[PDB]
Amino acid sequence: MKKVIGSIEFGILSPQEIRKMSAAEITVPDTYDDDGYPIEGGLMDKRLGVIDPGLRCETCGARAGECPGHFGHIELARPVIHVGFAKTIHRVLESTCRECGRIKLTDEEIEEYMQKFEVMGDRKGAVDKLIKEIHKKAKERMVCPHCGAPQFPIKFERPTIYWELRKDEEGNEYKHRMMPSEVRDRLEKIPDKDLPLLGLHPEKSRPEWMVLTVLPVPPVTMRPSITLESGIRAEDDLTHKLVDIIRINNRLKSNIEAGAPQLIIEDLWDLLQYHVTTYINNETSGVPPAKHKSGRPLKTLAQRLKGKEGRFRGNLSGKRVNFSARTVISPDPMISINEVGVPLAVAMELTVPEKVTEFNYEKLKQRVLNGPEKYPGANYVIDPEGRRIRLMESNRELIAEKLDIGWTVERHLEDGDVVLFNRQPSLHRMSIMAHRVRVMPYRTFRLNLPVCPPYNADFDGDEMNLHVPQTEEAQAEAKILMEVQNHIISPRYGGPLIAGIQDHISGGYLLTREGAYFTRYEVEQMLMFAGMDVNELPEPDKYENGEPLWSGKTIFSLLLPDDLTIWYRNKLCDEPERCEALEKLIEEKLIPDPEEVRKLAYDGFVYIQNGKLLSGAVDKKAYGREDGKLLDIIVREYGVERARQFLDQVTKLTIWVITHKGFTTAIDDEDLPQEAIDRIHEIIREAEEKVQRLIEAYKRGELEPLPGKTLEETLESKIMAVLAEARDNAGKVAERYLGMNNHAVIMAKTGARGKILNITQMAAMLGQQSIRGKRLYRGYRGRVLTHFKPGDLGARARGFVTNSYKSGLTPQEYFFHAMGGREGLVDTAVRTAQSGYMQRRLINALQDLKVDYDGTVRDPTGIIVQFKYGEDGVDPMKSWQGKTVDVDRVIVRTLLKMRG
């Protein structure tokens, strides 16, 4: 049968257990001889395992690559204090009597502490608090309650040095060094009944085991030895540390057997203690770390376990996996959000293991008969007994003829196969989704554009990874849970994440704007491009020059479901009167006539009645990320598959619109007439005059301190406020003098790409350059640059750039903008590390929380963190703008459904 590890019990290894688990005794501080063979009794002994392929292990008889490795033991001449337990040892040394060995507590106190230990349960914090309280109470008693022997304070010196404060016959206070043998002898006197009071297990954590008498040398496999390209074997750091330990132990044994004086024995004991302490942890405080002959410090077991590169993080929590690829991504609007572009070279390398059944026997037989060099083919074949055979040209037909039910065929990646698509860093669960394999003959990955905002991935050389599940359970889990269309709504804010961006928004605005009409050929072409099932063209809206014309709203209406009705305001609202009139007309009748709506239709108010876009222009508020109301309603009211189809169709339609109608930006997009430039210059002169007046008022002393502030930062804040008002006025002038016919203004207003400030910065001014939230001050004495007078606090001398990008900046203003950009870049480069550390901390704090079947969130111990998740038991992904149920939307939709 099969068994799993139900629980793990920790403890301290006893010397008897170390001796029993050891397959050999190590006494030679060497690894290999001149010819390269292992030395008997050495660290590289075959009894501890084999790394070289030729050798065969003595203990288990297995060759390299399959021998698990066997531990050894070293009999230390003298006991050595374990550093990791050392401080804990001191605690026990402050809790037990030096003669009787019992704890320094009364019987009643011991019993009361036993009841306290039994009552509280299994919470770790209470146990540590009780242990600390018991240690503090026992450490202040100088008389043993059981024997009456006097006690002395014990001073702990890092890392493994113990001093006992003793008194001579003359009353002088001196320090006696407690040798590890004396410490172990004192620890041996503590009975098993007092161990729970000290936080030690009677049968698993005996204090005498905290002092090392037998050192467990690791197996050969866990510290492997390799041969370099120069023919010289490269030993591990642990091997060198163990060589030093064995040499020092042998020297100590020889000196002890020779009757060496006490000066020799304690010196060698200290050397062995230092070696063992470095072997346990080379980064111990208060000691010099062990270094190689080249001056490189070694990393021992503690550094192997801890750290980012340690076993826990670099090998256990996260590790490299098989059947994975990684390459650059390129855009592909022609594929669905469910599909990923897999290169042919990647597809012919990564293989899906498919078992031969009664329905896929012919397909897998054809895959085997194609071979690894022909697509679609196979690379490996596994028989039911379990031998894997690689398919070459010779046995390609023979294996195909031998194929039967129960065999496994590692076939090439085919269309429709489910694979994982992950981009690093993975800040959220939406950073990986299961896509469908689409095989194309190029070299790069291809990912659909609406799936990019979930990945936070652009196409400026982004690298993305792909993982192919092997087991059927993993493939099913990827297909059902982590499918792309199932994660359109972001659980972080309950809004659309998989959404149209940039050119999708621009094409939607171009199609759905007022006065946008298309010919019959254009309408048929966009219908075919978007893959819509429109068999017959709708009635044309108007006839121009004898030919029919279709409104873009009519074409957009075919995407929406026939029973959809929603009205809202978008970001293109600048005349609230028309929007208010439309809202009032909708409010009275609740089913306004389409002719009545079209009479007073406004691009700033989106209104869809029965799937017909009667008014409004498409922008980021329609199906953009974090703002699309239409996409949010479509996902929640019509499922995810219909939402995915709508997203694909609308993205293709908008791409067709933006491709053939013509979308471009030029140098005249930021061009302004002479009146706008004159107004901007007037604003500049007014701002500099106000700044100079403020400076003069501060100099003459009539400037008023702000409440709680002195002259300097008050004047600085006033100057910054004046410059901000000037920047706002310049931006308002630029917006006034730039119409909606501008493509850059279209992109800024519709929310496709960029902002209004971006156009303002390229046309009107750059504003004031600020560092760390204040004006630029770092530089020379009294000035930032030497081109200004010292002590000048003017706008031009402190980072206020008057000209824009189109007019070109002065060298001083260019330098100030460089300081601002450098500050921004440093801000992001500093923020990323802190954000990642905080994310890791939060994840490790909340990794184990899970909603149970009764709706309660509990920790693995059993403590109910929440009796109901979110206090209402509602998924934030399925929540409506952070609310439980959108009563307004439900009522309106139901009323419209019953009225229609």
């Binding site: 630029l776 770092r778 590390a833």
Partner: protein, 196 residues
């Protein structure tokens, strides 16, 4: 304590006790600098101001590396002559003092300390990354690497006052050409008009 004061307390003033009194004078000019800022007589100087910042070039690092290598070579030669005198004796040592000194020298012991520091980029005294592989991607990269300046500050440390551009970098440090990520600000390039 005498050795510590002689070899650690302002070694740039000397190591002999005779100049010790003068070191006290150098202490006094420190105390004033501490006192005035504690009393408002003088302002705090900028650590990132280039008047207080020097640029160790390849010559100074080569001088330090050659000093370390020559000291180790000197100690090796001293051990070699000591061993030769202890083995052969006074007769063979002083019969030809020209050959005795020459044979007690191992030049490679010096050489393998210099070029190795120019190979791995590790410098004596804990300094590392001094020597790097020259970038040969194109004509621009090699010139940028040859006109590159690094900082001893750690890359993971947020140095808001050090990574940001300074007003004294005009004409000395390029205001725009900086690397991204943790290397931003701490790694700069010399300006076209910069003279050292």
């Amino acid at each position: 304590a005498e050795h510590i004061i002689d070899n650690n307390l302002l070694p740039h003033m000397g190591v002999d006790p005779e100049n010790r009194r003068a070191k006290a004078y150098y202490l006094g000019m420190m105390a004033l600098k501490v006192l005035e800022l504690s009393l408002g007589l003088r302002g705090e100087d900028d650590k990132d101001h280039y008047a207080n910042k020097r640029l160790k070039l390849a010559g100074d690092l080569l001088k330090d590396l050659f000093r370390v290598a020559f000291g180790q070579l000197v100690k090796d030669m001293q051990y070699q002559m000591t061993k030769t005198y202890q083995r052969k004796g006074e007769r063979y040592t002083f019969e030809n003092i020209q050959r005795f000194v020459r044979n007690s020298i191992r030049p490679d012991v010096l050489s393998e300390r210099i070029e190795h520091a120019l190979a791995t980029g590790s410098w004596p005294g804990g300094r590392t990354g001094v020597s790097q592989l020259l970038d040969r991607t194109n004509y621009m990269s090699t010139l940028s690497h040859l006109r590159r300046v690094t900082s001893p500050l750690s890359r993971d440390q947020p140095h808001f006052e050090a990574r940001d551009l300074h007003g004294t970098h005009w004409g000395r440090i390029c205001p725009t050409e900086t690397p991204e990520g943790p290397n931003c600000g701490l790694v700069k390039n010399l300006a076209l008009m910069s003279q050292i």
